[PDB]
């Protein structure tokens, strides 16, 4: 699959069976999704985002399926306006920026 | 060429021949660089950063040269901690996210 960049590259991932609309974002290092109640195995973490640091549950080994590629990968959970899939997941997905 | 995303995708662009390092950010709509002095034909904009607005100057038709591909594009300058090339320049360069 190939995302034209003429529109925002949003897509539906299935995080552990649950569907979320996420932005494929090569300028972000890690991911962070709002909405899914995800698990019981989380370290606390923090992330900035517009303003400053807010509180996130960071999960390891989560199952993400995107465009029929299922993958296990870390992800974080908290309040964002945008659900971001950063480079941590883009690389597990096998994605690349092309010429 | 295709770029994997193991590292931050940072490249030397040339803006009117002047080299700056920029982050290829598919997560960004627009583009903004600091430290470039592009002139007086611009319109004032204000763009929201994490923790507040910054005031910017928007220039049209600027010659960008990235990876041997020369295009013209709109570009803002302002005090940004990172020089981002958002989608408005990624599309002009013919760049795509691939899976």
Curated annotation (Swiss-Prot), chains A, B:
Residues 1-5, 49-55, 88-99 are annotated as: Dimerization of protease. Residues 20-89 form the Peptidase A2 domain. It comes from the Viruses. The active site is at residue 25. Coiled coil: none annotated. Homodimer, whose active site consists of two apposed aspartic acid residues. Aspartyl protease that mediates proteolytic cleavages of Gag and Gag-Pol polyproteins during or shortly after the release of the virion from the plasma membrane. Cleavages take place as an ordered, step-wise cascade to yield mature proteins. This process is called maturation. Displays maximal activity during the budding process just prior to particle release from the cell. Also cleaves Nef and Vif, probably concomitantly with viral structural proteins on maturation of virus particles. Hydrolyzes host EIF4GI and PABP1 in order to shut off the capped cellular mRNA translation. This is Protease. The lineage of its organism: Viruses, Riboviria, Pararnavirae, Artverviricota, Revtraviricetes. The gene is gag-pol. The chain holds residues 514 to 612 of 1464 of the full protein.
